[PDB]
Write a protein that holds these residues in place. Structure first.
Motif: not given
Ligand SMILES: Cc1cc2nc3c(=O)[nH]c(=O)nc-3n(C[C@H](O)[C@H](O)[C@H](O)COP(=O)(O)O)c2cc1C
Ligand SMILES: Cc1cc2nc3c(=O)[nH]c(=O)nc-3n(C[C@H](O)[C@H](O)[C@H](O)COP(=O)(O)O)c2cc1C
Ligand SMILES: Cc1cc2nc3c(=O)[nH]c(=O)nc-3n(C[C@H](O)[C@H](O)[C@H](O)COP(=O)(O)O)c2cc1C
Ligand SMILES: Cc1cc2nc3c(=O)[nH]c(=O)nc-3n(C[C@H](O)[C@H](O)[C@H](O)COP(=O)(O)O)c2cc1C
Ligand SMILES: O=S1c2ccccc2-c2ccccc21
Ligand SMILES: O=S1c2ccccc2-c2ccccc21
Ligand SMILES: O=S1c2ccccc2-c2ccccc21
Ligand SMILES: O=S1c2ccccc2-c2ccccc21
Lengths: 400, 400, 400, 400
Positions: B199-219
């Motif tokens: 099904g679907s998942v809705t994100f309402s102002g969800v904060v993602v912290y820098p240590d949770e990021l996988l690579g850099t944007p567009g990598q």
């Protein structure tokens, strides 16, 4: 064209509700009454007996049209005409003069109780035992009794037992479905064809009167072995099934195309701009629509031949055999087509056609997959091969 | 050997209950927990970090075995490894040092929230807005979020918005499923794969912290364009799908065979005496079992090549492209096989396999017909054809 | 890789002349001599007897590679190894000690004279009648004697007659092709496989000596029925056939692609600018290339199992029967593939590919269509189906 | 019936010699003269103009009949009627009142020089230069000029050049084949259809007189663009092709069945006693005979519609497009059928049907494989798909 307009309008109405109705299963009483009100159950009854005085090509066209909207209702409608064909091929002039006007006034929707669920299809155990004054008593359980629920008359088959004039003879009778001792069991719960009421029926002490017998006991066996006119029942009935399959095929192809036109997304990864211009989407519709066009045109030609032979006094074994070959061939082609098309068309629609169960497109595959097993296509193929290679026409029976 | 025995024992228990559970849909919580207790979710984590230190060939065989019992649980299990592979291919050594022992101790079962339901695939509207500290705020609704329910972590994808360093760059992150503002919606009611919670998942102002990021944007986009090692994610994942299809096919064949031996009746009209000796029944089992043997043997060799490249520090576009072509070829063969077999096997069982809905054999066709639509097999075919004829490897993407 | 390199170079040279050579039929003496000079005929003889000490996977790869260039030469080469396998499975230790160094020194290329043209394939009438000192005299005509022209030895099968130690036992012997009374008839004139020399051979009072007999009369019947080690001969040989089909398929696909790249015209009526970018041309190559990739990968696995069991001292019926099922499966898939591909690829090339007879692409269909009839694929399908449904392994014979 | 009896007798004679004749290639003069003597070239010429006054259904059935015996003669015969059809749709009543009696009296057998061998099928370079008296001069070389040898007239197409009233406009004419400057080159050497004389024809300063022109320059393009009655030429001609494929299919099935009855051996390994009773043999004949019956019956309906529109004064684009879609569908189905059965029927006959080249059964595959490439069936499929999905009739052209 009046009668086909009536069928087309019925089909349109059935499409509105088929999704919810076939989910529930059970008897489509409201829709069976709509068919009663339409007059189309009387298509083959002469105008002089109050019917519509129409032809088999019209009946076949109507069957496919209704089946394309609702396969269970197309099945019930088609089987009604298989039952009527059997009655008409064996009934006395006295029976027709009585029954056909009554079928018009009472709006008979015919069902049958014929096959059984024993060790093989040739193991019949429902007996007809002689009574005084020429009646018979029926005892036993039948299976796959299509249209048994809400049927006004039942075409019933039994084997004579404890009979002075010979046991093991096949008796056929047309009896009221509310005759004492007849218990329709309502155990139909199928993958598809969910509203055909093809459950079982139990006969305890059921009396059949001489004026309800369709010929003498064993006459059907003499008629089929001789190639008398009643031997047309099998090619007629197998062409009915063929038109169910062609109707399902057309309905699925049209329903898929509407979805593709309104809802499919272009696979822009490949540079496609609209799904309706995708070369492989177009190839899928083209391959299946082409096979359907040829099968439909072929089926119209064979339906005309049914009518031509229907009107003859005598049909030679060669004429009956050639017709059965043509009908078997049509059924084989229609079987392969409908089974492949109802599954593969998802590939022209995309994942969301399956991700939403309620879209209900799988109804087409479920209906076709259930009914096409009626009798195994592999032995229809063997019969056509035995004709072509060995010049042997199939042996007239209930299935060939 | 031990890992595959555990998978086999899991599959056995799933087979007992799948018919009832999949009708209900929803979340197979008890079975997800049995997979957590089995340790198999850690198959690809190194022994150094607490995992089983096993190989992709073992994972793929385990996926097929579980899928053969319960296609939804095979899908959930397989997708967990697709999520894991993305994490492993883009995460830093520091991230894995923390995440992977955590995943072992806490028995993580991964899910994802990646695709969306707009004009075409990868027309993405779920945004990642940068915050001053390097976190991102996520907003929007994702579709087809397999394994979203009861997930310990979600692999999530978004496109940068209001970003001085460039809008529209894809970011990915691995986040807790109960992070504030994440709503897993439970709106999955599908033809097949009914317990995958897609099904679907809705994100309402969800904060993602820098240590949770996988690579850099567009990598991810640049790795795709390079055909470098992280672009292995697609052939790995497409071979996961392939093993779902091979597992469903094997399960359908063995379930049909059980019914044929126990229930099918001989077609005595043709003189046959046991259905298991019918020449046409045997031909159906032989044709499909033969294709299954070859497909499975081929898949094992491709899985071996997945492991080889998984272990390399660097992977060239040519090695990646050759692997993708081999995976695409396996998926094509498996797709055609499972779609044909799950429908045609009714012809080797007989009408009563369909007449009784509760037999439930149609689950195999429904599961395979649903999943094989994930991405269109027509373009996998085009990709192999473009490679063979024009020597062009597929353009790397989330689908090729 | 040295041996495969030699096979690849031989195949390159054969490709240059196959079009002209196979037209004329008859014996490819220069090409057979080229194979002699290569040493590859000794792939399976141990280095300590002068051979190459290589393995069955190498042989199978070389067969497919040569077949891709010239199906007749691939057939001759492969049948040499079927002949050798029979000899190795039944020959006494002193026969091996004399024959194998001799076969290296004299660069032996083996043929056989085994089958006959009576009422059915079991109907053998070439007789072995006892002579003094344990010799036999052979009389009668064999059919389909592949590689019988220019053969250094013939593997010959006869049935005992007028034998006090028992009539109708099958004897096998390895004899010189120019022994007195052996008449190779030179009547092979075939649709495809035109240079395999598979015509008739007539035996007139041909003496066979005890040191030429391969086991005792009737020994092959016992070894096959008991599943002793010589029962590997049939899966070995049927996998040889499989690699002919895979080699032809790869050769036809590659030859077609060359024509499509350089001669096919774009169907500009539909706005196509390059035939190599046509979506339906690409779909044909993709379909068949995908199936070939899977079939080839699967064939490699089964060839390795051949080597594994070849090295065993004893092979159980489960091991032999599972190998024969895997071989039969591979052959079924390869048969369907090569017969469809060699015909359908014209649709990816265009009319001028058939309208210019000199292009000669039909050679692939002619070769494949001829050889695939060796034994009927329908009964290979039944054998796989009988195993999967009924857990019955094939009963060993010369065909299963 | 008279006319069909004459065609049946011609076919029976052609059957006697076709195997030997088609090896040689070249021109079947004696058989063309037998067709001239039969009167059947005048089938569509009205009795008023000395012809038979017959209909398209008779013509199509005669084409299929002759094609079943000799595909080249069926082709030559059928293309005569495609050439006649073009003349009838574009010539004036004054022209037809002279030509048609002359065609009867002089026993005209028509050929054509139309297509070319440039970069793609639309690229036409044979030019028509207007001369001051209204004549044209034709220059250049045509390819695929079926029936150009021994032709009493050639239907010729060119594009205007050096034309003050517009270059590139298509002109058609009917001219003697021995007019000065016409050179028929006898370079046809094809895989199948070997006696259709579809080689090249070179035009050197060839004069066309005003009363030989069919319409005005560009008139055919205007008729295609408007979907008016002359654009029926395409569906008529494509249905001629369709009957060549149905004829070849029937001929091949009947020839194979004679071998199966006469020469095939039972597969006693599997317990078969008669090849004609083998279940898989019977299944092949049944599958293909059934498809052929349906295809032939559907083809008859379409042939009746051709005749219907042929007799109309005006034809709308909707009528033309509907007919073209029906013809395309028949062609698709017949193409797939003939290509599969002419290859697969070997499996019903056995190895010796291919190992004995002189049996010559491959002629059916070669003929059908060659002709079915005339235009790509892939785009006939796209055309039917575009109609069914998007309600777009095919764009009228020489191919659609
Ligand atoms: C059963 C099923 C599960 C899916 N699971 C995921 C998923 O976990 N993640 C994802 O990004 N897409 C998932 N997809 C979606 C595909 O990537 C793709 O967006 C979708 O199938 C395309 O839909 P369409 O063909 O109707 O346009 C799933 C699709 C199906 C059918
Ligand atoms: C949907 C459906 C409807 C059927 N209706 C009838 C019927 O009305 N009358 C009848 O005699 N048999 C009917 N049959 C049964 C067949 O004649 C046959 O008895 C049965 O399909 C064989 O079952 P098996 O293949 O499992 O052995 C019906 C079967 C199906 C599947
Ligand atoms: C057996 C055969 C006969 C043909 N006869 C004609 C013909 O009589 N007139 C014509 O204009 N084209 C004829 N064609 C050609 C087609 O119109 C078309 O140009 C050709 O099939 C395209 O070839 P390609 O696919 O290699 O590009 C014939 C083609 C074949 C294969
Ligand atoms: C190209 C070809 C080569 C063959 N070579 C041999 C051979 O070397 N030894 C042998 O015993 N049979 C050989 N066979 C024959 C098969 O074993 C079998 O006897 C034959 O294909 C059956 O013929 P039928 O199907 O016409 O009845 C060959 C068959 C073909 C078609
Ligand atoms: O085809 S069914 C059937 C099979 C076998 C015996 C009788 C009957 C019967 C009667 C009416 C409708 C349908 C059927
Ligand atoms: O194949 S799915 C997919 C399609 C497109 C973008 C991302 C993803 C993704 C991530 C994890 C599992 C499965 C999928
Ligand atoms: O497969 S063939 C064959 C069929 C039947 C009996 C014997 C033989 C034989 C011997 C050597 C090579 C090939 C073959
Ligand atoms: O179908 S062929 C063709 C293709 C393209 C242009 C013209 C013609 C033509 C004329 C007469 C017969 C056959 C053909």
């Amino acid at each position: 064209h009046r009668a086909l307009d009536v069928a087309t309008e019925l089909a349109k109405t059935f499409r509105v509700t088929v999704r919810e109705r076939e989910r529930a299963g059970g008897t489509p009483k409201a829709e069976r009454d709509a068919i009663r009100r339409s007059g189309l159950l009387t298509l083959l009854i002469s105008k002089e007996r109050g019917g519509l005085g129409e032809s088999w090509p019209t009946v076949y066209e109507a069957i496919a049209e209704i089946a394309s909207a609702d396969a269970s209702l197309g099945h019930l409608f088609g089987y009604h005409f298989s039952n009527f064909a059997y009655v008409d091929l064996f009934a006395s002039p006295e029976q027709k003069a009585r029954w056909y006007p009554q079928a018009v006034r009472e709006r008979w929707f015919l069902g049958n109780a014929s096959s059984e669920n024993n060790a093989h299809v040739l193991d019949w155990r429902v007996t007809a035992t002689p009574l005084p004054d020429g009646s018979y008593e029926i005892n036993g359980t039948k299976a796959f009794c299509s249209g048994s629920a809400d049927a006004d008359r039942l075409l019933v088959f039994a084997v004579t037992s404890r009979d002075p004039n010979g046991d093991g003879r096949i008796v056929a009778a047309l009896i009221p479905s509310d005759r004492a001792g007849v218990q329709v069991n309502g155990d139909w719960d199928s993958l598809g064809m969910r509203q055909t009421d093809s459950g079982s029926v139990t006969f305890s002490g059921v009396v059949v009167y001489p004026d309800e017998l369709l010929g003498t006991p064993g006459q059907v066996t003499d008629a089929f072995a001789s190639g008398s006119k009643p031997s047309l029942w099998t090619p007629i009935t197998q062409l009915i099934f063929t038109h169910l399959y062609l109707g399902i095929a057309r309905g699925a192809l049209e329903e898929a195309a509407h979805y593709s036109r309104s809802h499919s997304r272009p696979f822009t990864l490949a540079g496609v701009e609209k799904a309706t211009e995708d070369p492989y989407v177009l190839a899928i519709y083209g391959e299946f629509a082409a096979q359907l066009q040829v099968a439909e045109a072929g089926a119209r030609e064979v339906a005309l031949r049914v009518q031509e032979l229907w009107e003859r006094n005598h049909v030679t074994p060669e004429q009956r055999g050639q017709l059965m070959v043509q009908v078997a061939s049509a059924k084989i082609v229609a079987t392969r087509l409908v089974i492949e098309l109802t599954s593969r068309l998802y590939e022209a629609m995309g994942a969301r056609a399956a991700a939403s169960r309620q879209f209900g497109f799988d109804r087409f595959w479920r209906d076709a997959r259930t009914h096409t097993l009626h009798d195994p296509v592999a032995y229809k193929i063997r019969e056509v091969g035995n004709w072509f290679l060995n010049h042997r026409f199939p042996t007239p029976s209930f299935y060939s």
